[PDB]
Structure formats: structure tokens, C-alpha cells
Amino acid sequence: NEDYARPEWMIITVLPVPPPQVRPSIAMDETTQGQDDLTHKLSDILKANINVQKLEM
Amino acid sequence: LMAQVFFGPTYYQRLRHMVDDKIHARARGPVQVLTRQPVEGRSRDGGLR
RNA sequence: UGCCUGGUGUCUUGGGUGU
């Protein structure tokens, strides 16, 4: 569909970052809280993006 | 009684399942952080599915 | 006059209850 599903949109060029409501953090104990799995995966993705940008230039 | 009754001693044993350890009710209470639905468990004042 | 408090992990696993 030209308006809604264009074929080139199947390739990701910009990634949407969900709000913390989607990936809430949990307090494992009284002091240390735990980052969610999605948060760690997004951190890894962003590190890889930074690495690619640094290497390219 | 018009009917005679079978009558005698028998060995009975009390099992761990008592009603006061199973009765549970909930009007409102804690909810999960991710889904904002009632938590699971009688010990946690949870809801029924 | 010295004045009163609601806020509860997550993920696995294991053993059980009723069909």
C-alpha cells in the first residue's frame, strides 16, 4: 500500500525507543535495582551504533 | 432408627489442607508494575484469573 | 496541647490441590 505499507520501510534506518513504561526497572533488593532486558539490549544496540560511527570516520 | 447402622472404630488422618489456609477475597489492592493488573497469589493479596 | 504511616521484586525451578 502506497499510503501505509511501503516496501522500503521494511528496512530499518531509524529505530523507535520505547518509553520506560514498556521496559520497567525492578528493585532486586533494598539498594540495587535491576535494568530490564530491553534496556540492556537497547544499550548494546546503541554501543554498536556508536562503534560503527566511530570506525567509519 | 428403622435401619441399623454400621458402627465401629476406624483410623482416620488429618490432611494438611485446611480451609483457613485457602479462603481468599479481594476488592482492590496491589497491581503489577508492567501491566497494572492484580498481582498473583493469596499471600500477596492477589486477584483471581 | 504534644500529636499519627500505607508502600512492595523479578526470573527460574521444584513439590503439591482439584478436576
mmCIF file with all atom_site columns, C-alpha atoms (C1' of nucleotides) in Angstrom:
data_model
loop_
_atom_site.group_PDB
_atom_site.id
_atom_site.type_symbol
_atom_site.label_atom_id
_atom_site.label_alt_id
_atom_site.label_comp_id
_atom_site.label_asym_id
_atom_site.label_entity_id
_atom_site.label_seq_id
_atom_site.pdbx_PDB_ins_code
_atom_site.Cartn_x
_atom_site.Cartn_y
_atom_site.Cartn_z
_atom_site.occupancy
_atom_site.B_iso_or_equiv
_atom_site.pdbx_formal_charge
_atom_site.auth_seq_id
_atom_site.auth_comp_id
_atom_site.auth_asym_id
_atom_site.auth_atom_id
_atom_site.pdbx_PDB_model_num
ATOM 1   C CA    . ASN A 1 1  ? 0.000   0.000   0.000  1.00 0.00 ? 1  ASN A CA    1
ATOM 2   C CA    . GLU A 1 2  ? 1.429   3.356   -1.037 1.00 0.00 ? 2  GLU A CA    1
ATOM 3   C CA    . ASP A 1 3  ? -0.004  5.215   1.957  1.00 0.00 ? 3  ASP A CA    1
ATOM 4   C CA    . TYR A 1 4  ? 0.529   2.703   4.753  1.00 0.00 ? 4  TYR A CA    1
ATOM 5   C CA    . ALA A 1 5  ? 2.926   -0.139  3.847  1.00 0.00 ? 5  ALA A CA    1
ATOM 6   C CA    . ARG A 1 6  ? 5.669   0.998   1.501  1.00 0.00 ? 6  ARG A CA    1
ATOM 7   C CA    . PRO A 1 7  ? 8.195   -1.737  0.612  1.00 0.00 ? 7  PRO A CA    1
ATOM 8   C CA    . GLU A 1 8  ? 11.336  0.196   1.547  1.00 0.00 ? 8  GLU A CA    1
ATOM 9   C CA    . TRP A 1 9  ? 10.017  0.671   5.090  1.00 0.00 ? 9  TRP A CA    1
ATOM 10  C CA    . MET A 1 10 ? 10.856  -2.996  5.723  1.00 0.00 ? 10 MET A CA    1
ATOM 11  C CA    . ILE A 1 11 ? 14.499  -1.908  6.159  1.00 0.00 ? 11 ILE A CA    1
ATOM 12  C CA    . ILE A 1 12 ? 15.222  -0.205  9.480  1.00 0.00 ? 12 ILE A CA    1
ATOM 13  C CA    . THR A 1 13 ? 17.046  3.118   9.204  1.00 0.00 ? 13 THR A CA    1
ATOM 14  C CA    . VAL A 1 14 ? 15.771  4.753   12.407 1.00 0.00 ? 14 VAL A CA    1
ATOM 15  C CA    . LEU A 1 15 ? 14.794  2.751   15.483 1.00 0.00 ? 15 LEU A CA    1
ATOM 16  C CA    . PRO A 1 16 ? 11.970  3.785   17.843 1.00 0.00 ? 16 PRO A CA    1
ATOM 17  C CA    . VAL A 1 17 ? 12.961  3.646   21.517 1.00 0.00 ? 17 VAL A CA    1
ATOM 18  C CA    . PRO A 1 18 ? 10.009  2.601   23.712 1.00 0.00 ? 18 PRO A CA    1
ATOM 19  C CA    . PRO A 1 19 ? 9.283   4.551   26.897 1.00 0.00 ? 19 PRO A CA    1
ATOM 20  C CA    . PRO A 1 20 ? 10.272  3.150   30.307 1.00 0.00 ? 20 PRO A CA    1
ATOM 21  C CA    . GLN A 1 21 ? 6.659   2.045   30.823 1.00 0.00 ? 21 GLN A CA    1
ATOM 22  C CA    . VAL A 1 22 ? 7.347   -0.733  28.317 1.00 0.00 ? 22 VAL A CA    1
ATOM 23  C CA    . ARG A 1 23 ? 10.630  -1.760  30.000 1.00 0.00 ? 23 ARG A CA    1
ATOM 24  C CA    . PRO A 1 24 ? 10.238  -1.003  33.708 1.00 0.00 ? 24 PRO A CA    1
ATOM 25  C CA    . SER A 1 25 ? 13.097  -1.500  36.133 1.00 0.00 ? 25 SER A CA    1
ATOM 26  C CA    . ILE A 1 26 ? 12.801  -3.759  39.176 1.00 0.00 ? 26 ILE A CA    1
ATOM 27  C CA    . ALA A 1 27 ? 14.360  -3.276  42.612 1.00 0.00 ? 27 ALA A CA    1
ATOM 28  C CA    . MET A 1 28 ? 16.040  -6.622  43.273 1.00 0.00 ? 28 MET A CA    1
ATOM 29  C CA    . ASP A 1 29 ? 16.874  -5.651  46.861 1.00 0.00 ? 29 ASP A CA    1
ATOM 30  C CA    . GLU A 1 30 ? 16.597  -2.599  49.100 1.00 0.00 ? 30 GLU A CA    1
ATOM 31  C CA    . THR A 1 31 ? 19.563  -0.883  47.397 1.00 0.00 ? 31 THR A CA    1
ATOM 32  C CA    . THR A 1 32 ? 20.290  -2.248  43.900 1.00 0.00 ? 32 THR A CA    1
ATOM 33  C CA    . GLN A 1 33 ? 17.670  -2.063  41.155 1.00 0.00 ? 33 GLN A CA    1
ATOM 34  C CA    . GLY A 1 34 ? 17.778  -4.163  38.013 1.00 0.00 ? 34 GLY A CA    1
ATOM 35  C CA    . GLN A 1 35 ? 17.713  -2.888  34.448 1.00 0.00 ? 35 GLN A CA    1
ATOM 36  C CA    . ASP A 1 36 ? 15.236  -4.634  32.182 1.00 0.00 ? 36 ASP A CA    1
ATOM 37  C CA    . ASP A 1 37 ? 16.288  -6.926  29.348 1.00 0.00 ? 37 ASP A CA    1
ATOM 38  C CA    . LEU A 1 38 ? 15.068  -4.469  26.715 1.00 0.00 ? 38 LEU A CA    1
ATOM 39  C CA    . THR A 1 39 ? 17.105  -1.694  28.332 1.00 0.00 ? 39 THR A CA    1
ATOM 40  C CA    . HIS A 1 40 ? 20.288  -3.769  28.144 1.00 0.00 ? 40 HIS A CA    1
ATOM 41  C CA    . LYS A 1 41 ? 19.573  -4.754  24.544 1.00 0.00 ? 41 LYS A CA    1
ATOM 42  C CA    . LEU A 1 42 ? 19.000  -1.121  23.582 1.00 0.00 ? 42 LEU A CA    1
ATOM 43  C CA    . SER A 1 43 ? 22.266  -0.193  25.302 1.00 0.00 ? 43 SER A CA    1
ATOM 44  C CA    . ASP A 1 44 ? 24.060  -2.855  23.256 1.00 0.00 ? 44 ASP A CA    1
ATOM 45  C CA    . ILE A 1 45 ? 22.444  -1.609  20.044 1.00 0.00 ? 45 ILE A CA    1
ATOM 46  C CA    . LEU A 1 46 ? 23.428  1.981   20.811 1.00 0.00 ? 46 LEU A CA    1
ATOM 47  C CA    . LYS A 1 47 ? 27.010  0.950   21.626 1.00 0.00 ? 47 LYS A CA    1
ATOM 48  C CA    . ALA A 1 48 ? 27.224  -0.859  18.296 1.00 0.00 ? 48 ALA A CA    1
ATOM 49  C CA    . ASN A 1 49 ? 25.864  2.228   16.534 1.00 0.00 ? 49 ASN A CA    1
ATOM 50  C CA    . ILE A 1 50 ? 28.483  4.411   18.224 1.00 0.00 ? 50 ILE A CA    1
ATOM 51  C CA    . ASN A 1 51 ? 31.179  1.906   17.268 1.00 0.00 ? 51 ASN A CA    1
ATOM 52  C CA    . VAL A 1 52 ? 30.124  1.933   13.610 1.00 0.00 ? 52 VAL A CA    1
ATOM 53  C CA    . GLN A 1 53 ? 30.044  5.734   13.515 1.00 0.00 ? 53 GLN A CA    1
ATOM 54  C CA    . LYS A 1 54 ? 33.485  5.989   15.127 1.00 0.00 ? 54 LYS A CA    1
ATOM 55  C CA    . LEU A 1 55 ? 35.023  3.373   12.835 1.00 0.00 ? 55 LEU A CA    1
ATOM 56  C CA    . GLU A 1 56 ? 33.581  4.903   9.669  1.00 0.00 ? 56 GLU A CA    1
ATOM 57  C CA    . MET A 1 57 ? 35.065  8.380   10.100 1.00 0.00 ? 57 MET A CA    1
ATOM 58  C CA    . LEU B 2 1  ? -33.937 -45.710 63.671 1.00 0.00 ? 1  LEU B CA    1
ATOM 59  C CA    . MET B 2 2  ? -35.689 -48.121 61.331 1.00 0.00 ? 2  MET B CA    1
ATOM 60  C CA    . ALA B 2 3  ? -32.352 -49.088 59.756 1.00 0.00 ? 3  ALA B CA    1
ATOM 61  C CA    . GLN B 2 4  ? -29.472 -50.452 61.796 1.00 0.00 ? 4  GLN B CA    1
ATOM 62  C CA    . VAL B 2 5  ? -26.165 -48.628 61.498 1.00 0.00 ? 5  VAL B CA    1
ATOM 63  C CA    . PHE B 2 6  ? -22.717 -49.973 60.687 1.00 0.00 ? 6  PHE B CA    1
ATOM 64  C CA    . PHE B 2 7  ? -20.655 -48.842 63.629 1.00 0.00 ? 7  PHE B CA    1
ATOM 65  C CA    . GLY B 2 8  ? -17.068 -49.172 64.802 1.00 0.00 ? 8  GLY B CA    1
ATOM 66  C CA    . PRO B 2 9  ? -13.650 -47.552 65.125 1.00 0.00 ? 9  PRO B CA    1
ATOM 67  C CA    . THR B 2 10 ? -11.540 -46.690 62.104 1.00 0.00 ? 10 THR B CA    1
ATOM 68  C CA    . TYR B 2 11 ? -8.161  -44.999 61.736 1.00 0.00 ? 11 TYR B CA    1
ATOM 69  C CA    . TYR B 2 12 ? -8.505  -41.510 60.259 1.00 0.00 ? 12 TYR B CA    1
ATOM 70  C CA    . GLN B 2 13 ? -5.797  -38.984 59.476 1.00 0.00 ? 13 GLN B CA    1
ATOM 71  C CA    . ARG B 2 14 ? -5.951  -35.199 59.217 1.00 0.00 ? 14 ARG B CA    1
ATOM 72  C CA    . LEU B 2 15 ? -4.588  -33.768 55.987 1.00 0.00 ? 15 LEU B CA    1
ATOM 73  C CA    . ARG B 2 16 ? -2.655  -30.526 55.605 1.00 0.00 ? 16 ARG B CA    1
ATOM 74  C CA    . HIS B 2 17 ? -5.351  -28.810 53.523 1.00 0.00 ? 17 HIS B CA    1
ATOM 75  C CA    . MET B 2 18 ? -7.434  -26.613 55.822 1.00 0.00 ? 18 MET B CA    1
ATOM 76  C CA    . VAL B 2 19 ? -9.995  -24.078 54.675 1.00 0.00 ? 19 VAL B CA    1
ATOM 77  C CA    . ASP B 2 20 ? -8.467  -21.202 56.637 1.00 0.00 ? 20 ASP B CA    1
ATOM 78  C CA    . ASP B 2 21 ? -5.299  -21.609 54.554 1.00 0.00 ? 21 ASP B CA    1
ATOM 79  C CA    . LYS B 2 22 ? -7.303  -21.406 51.313 1.00 0.00 ? 22 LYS B CA    1
ATOM 80  C CA    . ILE B 2 23 ? -10.009 -18.767 51.850 1.00 0.00 ? 23 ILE B CA    1
ATOM 81  C CA    . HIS B 2 24 ? -9.197  -15.573 49.975 1.00 0.00 ? 24 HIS B CA    1
ATOM 82  C CA    . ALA B 2 25 ? -11.065 -12.458 48.863 1.00 0.00 ? 25 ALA B CA    1
ATOM 83  C CA    . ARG B 2 26 ? -10.037 -9.248  47.150 1.00 0.00 ? 26 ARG B CA    1
ATOM 84  C CA    . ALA B 2 27 ? -11.788 -5.954  46.457 1.00 0.00 ? 27 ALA B CA    1
ATOM 85  C CA    . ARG B 2 28 ? -8.809  -3.807  45.446 1.00 0.00 ? 28 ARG B CA    1
ATOM 86  C CA    . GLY B 2 29 ? -5.104  -3.936  46.125 1.00 0.00 ? 29 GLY B CA    1
ATOM 87  C CA    . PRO B 2 30 ? -1.615  -4.124  44.658 1.00 0.00 ? 30 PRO B CA    1
ATOM 88  C CA    . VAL B 2 31 ? -1.169  -4.382  40.897 1.00 0.00 ? 31 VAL B CA    1
ATOM 89  C CA    . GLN B 2 32 ? 1.751   -5.352  38.700 1.00 0.00 ? 32 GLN B CA    1
ATOM 90  C CA    . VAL B 2 33 ? 4.010   -2.545  37.529 1.00 0.00 ? 33 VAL B CA    1
ATOM 91  C CA    . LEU B 2 34 ? 4.227   -3.687  33.903 1.00 0.00 ? 34 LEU B CA    1
ATOM 92  C CA    . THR B 2 35 ? 0.571   -4.484  33.196 1.00 0.00 ? 35 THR B CA    1
ATOM 93  C CA    . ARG B 2 36 ? -1.289  -2.740  36.060 1.00 0.00 ? 36 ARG B CA    1
ATOM 94  C CA    . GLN B 2 37 ? -3.383  -5.856  36.675 1.00 0.00 ? 37 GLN B CA    1
ATOM 95  C CA    . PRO B 2 38 ? -3.918  -7.533  40.056 1.00 0.00 ? 38 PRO B CA    1
ATOM 96  C CA    . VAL B 2 39 ? -0.911  -9.455  41.345 1.00 0.00 ? 39 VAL B CA    1
ATOM 97  C CA    . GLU B 2 40 ? -0.861  -13.250 41.588 1.00 0.00 ? 40 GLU B CA    1
ATOM 98  C CA    . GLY B 2 41 ? -1.116  -15.086 44.883 1.00 0.00 ? 41 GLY B CA    1
ATOM 99  C CA    . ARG B 2 42 ? -3.233  -15.346 48.007 1.00 0.00 ? 42 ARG B CA    1
ATOM 100 C CA    . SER B 2 43 ? -0.242  -14.369 50.148 1.00 0.00 ? 43 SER B CA    1
ATOM 101 C CA    . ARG B 2 44 ? 0.219   -11.156 48.138 1.00 0.00 ? 44 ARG B CA    1
ATOM 102 C CA    . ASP B 2 45 ? -3.484  -10.182 48.203 1.00 0.00 ? 45 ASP B CA    1
ATOM 103 C CA    . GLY B 2 46 ? -3.698  -11.070 44.534 1.00 0.00 ? 46 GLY B CA    1
ATOM 104 C CA    . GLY B 2 47 ? -6.641  -11.437 42.213 1.00 0.00 ? 47 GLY B CA    1
ATOM 105 C CA    . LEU B 2 48 ? -8.325  -14.374 40.536 1.00 0.00 ? 48 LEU B CA    1
ATOM 106 C CA    . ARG B 2 49 ? -7.868  -15.187 36.872 1.00 0.00 ? 49 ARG B CA    1
ATOM 107 C "C1'" . U   C 3 1  ? -1.516  20.876  73.878 1.00 0.00 ? 1  U   C "C1'" 1
ATOM 108 C "C1'" . G   C 3 2  ? 2.103   17.296  72.132 1.00 0.00 ? 2  G   C "C1'" 1
ATOM 109 C "C1'" . C   C 3 3  ? 0.151   14.842  68.230 1.00 0.00 ? 3  C   C "C1'" 1
ATOM 110 C "C1'" . C   C 3 4  ? -0.232  9.510   63.621 1.00 0.00 ? 4  C   C "C1'" 1
ATOM 111 C "C1'" . U   C 3 5  ? 2.312   5.900   58.386 1.00 0.00 ? 5  U   C "C1'" 1
ATOM 112 C "C1'" . G   C 3 6  ? 0.034   2.653   53.823 1.00 0.00 ? 6  G   C "C1'" 1
ATOM 113 C "C1'" . G   C 3 7  ? 4.411   1.136   50.117 1.00 0.00 ? 7  G   C "C1'" 1
ATOM 114 C "C1'" . U   C 3 8  ? 6.179   -3.831  47.930 1.00 0.00 ? 8  U   C "C1'" 1
ATOM 115 C "C1'" . G   C 3 9  ? 10.937  -7.556  43.388 1.00 0.00 ? 9  G   C "C1'" 1
ATOM 116 C "C1'" . U   C 3 10 ? 11.647  -10.381 39.363 1.00 0.00 ? 10 U   C "C1'" 1
ATOM 117 C "C1'" . C   C 3 11 ? 13.048  -14.558 36.936 1.00 0.00 ? 11 C   C "C1'" 1
ATOM 118 C "C1'" . U   C 3 12 ? 13.636  -19.706 37.116 1.00 0.00 ? 12 U   C "C1'" 1
ATOM 119 C "C1'" . U   C 3 13 ? 12.740  -24.360 39.444 1.00 0.00 ? 13 U   C "C1'" 1
ATOM 120 C "C1'" . G   C 3 14 ? 10.538  -27.975 42.463 1.00 0.00 ? 14 G   C "C1'" 1
ATOM 121 C "C1'" . G   C 3 15 ? 6.781   -30.202 45.115 1.00 0.00 ? 15 G   C "C1'" 1
ATOM 122 C "C1'" . G   C 3 16 ? 1.677   -30.331 45.666 1.00 0.00 ? 16 G   C "C1'" 1
ATOM 123 C "C1'" . U   C 3 17 ? -4.571  -29.453 45.120 1.00 0.00 ? 17 U   C "C1'" 1
ATOM 124 C "C1'" . G   C 3 18 ? -8.992  -30.099 42.190 1.00 0.00 ? 18 G   C "C1'" 1
ATOM 125 C "C1'" . U   C 3 19 ? -10.905 -31.768 38.054 1.00 0.00 ? 19 U   C "C1'" 1
#
